[PDB]
Amino acid sequence: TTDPVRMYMREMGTVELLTREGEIDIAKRIEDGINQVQCSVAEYPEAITYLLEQYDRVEAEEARLSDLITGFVDDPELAREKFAELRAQYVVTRDTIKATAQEEILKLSEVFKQFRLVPKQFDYLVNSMRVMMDRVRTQERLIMKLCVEQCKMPKKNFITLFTGNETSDTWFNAAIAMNKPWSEKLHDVSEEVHRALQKLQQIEEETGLTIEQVKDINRRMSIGEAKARRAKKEMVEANLRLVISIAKKYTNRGLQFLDLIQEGNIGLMKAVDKFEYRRGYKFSTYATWWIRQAITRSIADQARTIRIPVHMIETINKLNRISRQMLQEMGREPTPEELAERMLMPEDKIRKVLKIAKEPISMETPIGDDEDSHLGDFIEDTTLELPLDSATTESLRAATHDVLAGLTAREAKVLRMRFGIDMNTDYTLEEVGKQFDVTRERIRQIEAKALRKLRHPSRSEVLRSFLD
Template identity: 65%
Template sequence: MSRKKEVENVENLENVEKIESLESLENVEETNTKASKKDKNESTTVSKIDQIVNSVKDKGKIDYSELAAQLGNFSPEEMEKLFDKLEKLNIQVANETVDIDDEEPNIEDLEEVEDLDIEDVNIDTLEGISVDDPVRMYLREIGKIPLLSFEDELKYAKLSYEHDEAAKQKLTESNLRLVVSIAKKYVGRGMLFLDLIQEGNMGLIKAVEKFDYTKGFKFSTYATWWIRQAITRAIADQARTIRIPVHMVETINKLIRTSRHLLQQNGREPTPEEIAVEMEIPVEKVLEIQKIAQDPVSLETPIGEEDDSHLGDFIPDDDSPSPQDAASYTMLKEQLNEVLETLTPREAKVLRLRFGLDDGKARTLEEVGKEFSVTRERIRQIEAKALRKLRHPSKSKKLKEYM
């Protein structure tokens, strides 16, 4: 009886091992299938990105509207990869002529993309970003907003298309995490993180207003375009005291990245010549970009520990005369007034108008003639007579030392 039980236990153990082996094999096959599908999707995405890049490489520039027309089957993450590659190749994505209030991207050819799981957008992943209390409060609030399923998103998109304000608000609130995810990529470009989020939210609102579900593409892809557009335009318009065009901002960013790369590679600050070789542009262009990239400095910047002096106090005015010249000019003016007082009032006024002694603007004979209601010839005679009087040694000796 004991021998029979032992045989049964062995058989049961062999059956369990067979089942576990089959399950393990099925799991391996399932994993390999998923990995194969993932690799295939990634390969397809890379191929499409390369196709878009190659189509605009020769031009070196592409409009946002033109690019948007080629973004079929692209999720926001894939769009980010495309933009990063375009930026690395110095292909400018021009939005200079696009007005976020009026212009709509040409996206009629966009096809429906894969469902973007916004739950994957982790708003807590903010490494390297200084987050103060207002930002934390905002992130905490939007984290409480439930996300929409694809079916719910489509339902609210239809209602929004029919001008349902409540649906528009629901669609906007459910995509606020997408704005944060995009905005954090632009930190460090001259605007506060909360300001970037605010500008991105404006783009999201515009996307909700203009989204047309009947064209068959996903809202998140459409919204990503508007969010990026709003943020990049805000950076160009607001990040600097003196506005720099969008295409130049992109060029400056590339120069900064190139400089950092050469610094890490050589262990020292790169020269303009080295940067020019790396960027394949003339040295003069590098110097021009560096000059444009400089931040303006206020003349009221405090100097010293006591803050009793400012930068403007130490900057000379090259256009102002030296103290010696200013004193000589004042004395000349006084001597000239004394000499003119020896003439008749009419003669003195004619000379003052003809030579601009009062306001620096010299008048023609015709203009002075109109002032006195006489002919040009008569003014010429008065001027000649007055100058003869001034050439008398008793008067001219007072002015010769200033000549």
């Protein structure tokens, strides 16, 4: 029926309400998903050393502790000694790679999982990971396209010696002599593949992981991330009805209905993001605060044609409340200074605050006759300059220009200099002294006589008429 209010009401009404048990189900799914990515982050060597390089910048006064960690499971001293533990577990696991290492690589993860990272930092890690995987995909697809598409080799036979290695020369130089139909064709592109293999094998140096593992790890991460959003989305969809129930209170506050319910939906999104079901707090009354918070916080900001800071808004509301009771309490209405004593502040601010708080009047407001004459049609232009004046400006130029030719060439130059007449800016009488080489008092005398010469009327009768 269009009217987008309806096509929403009907689109969400399909989603079935969550049972109190179903809520924990979804919340449980979230925990698994995130813990997967947490564990997946713990399994990246570069992810540890980077955190190390960051704390070494913290102890070197190149950063602050607030810009890196939000705290662990569970103060500068505690932070310092906790980071030492991480560094400790890294330096053992590092040298044990000579098979058995795995048991210690498993413990290095555990300690790292205690760190609750700042969201910005966490995002950068994952970004670094996905960017590293782009770097791997670049080389994977290059070596594939340089063989299959260019040199005409089937992909069926291209993957046999790839899996498990994709670094060393077992596949590239030992498979071209096999005399298969696709074998002898691989020589033309050899120069381009083997030189691009550099970054491919370098990744296992930087990241300290064979190209094998590099895909797996962030694949589980991808899976986990998907699961998280899946569940969280699911949760939000279940509680849309709650948002609707809250926004129906705030309707006429000056924002549209669908505007309200959308802003509230974001609040609900935040509520899911920060919710922990292990606390036993019913999800309804926990999200209500977040949803209600978003609505008001939005209404305060954008609902006005002139944005006002929050504290200003709250001030205004307090006045309405008093004016309500005091309307009938006083039998007339509180005097402009009445609410002033009731309110904390200097109390003369009532006038100022009350003025800027007012909403602008529609310039299209019809006034009179019902005719197309509208308020905006009556607002005159004050920034323009009337022609009856502009004519006198062009004249005054011709005036002073005439009267400055009646003087000596230096009096005109000195007077045109001391004022902005036909020149950029103007020059201080000391500056003028530098241009003429005879300086200080000398110039000032000349100025006096110049103004004096225009004072006694022959010159004077024309310029005096400009001041009325």
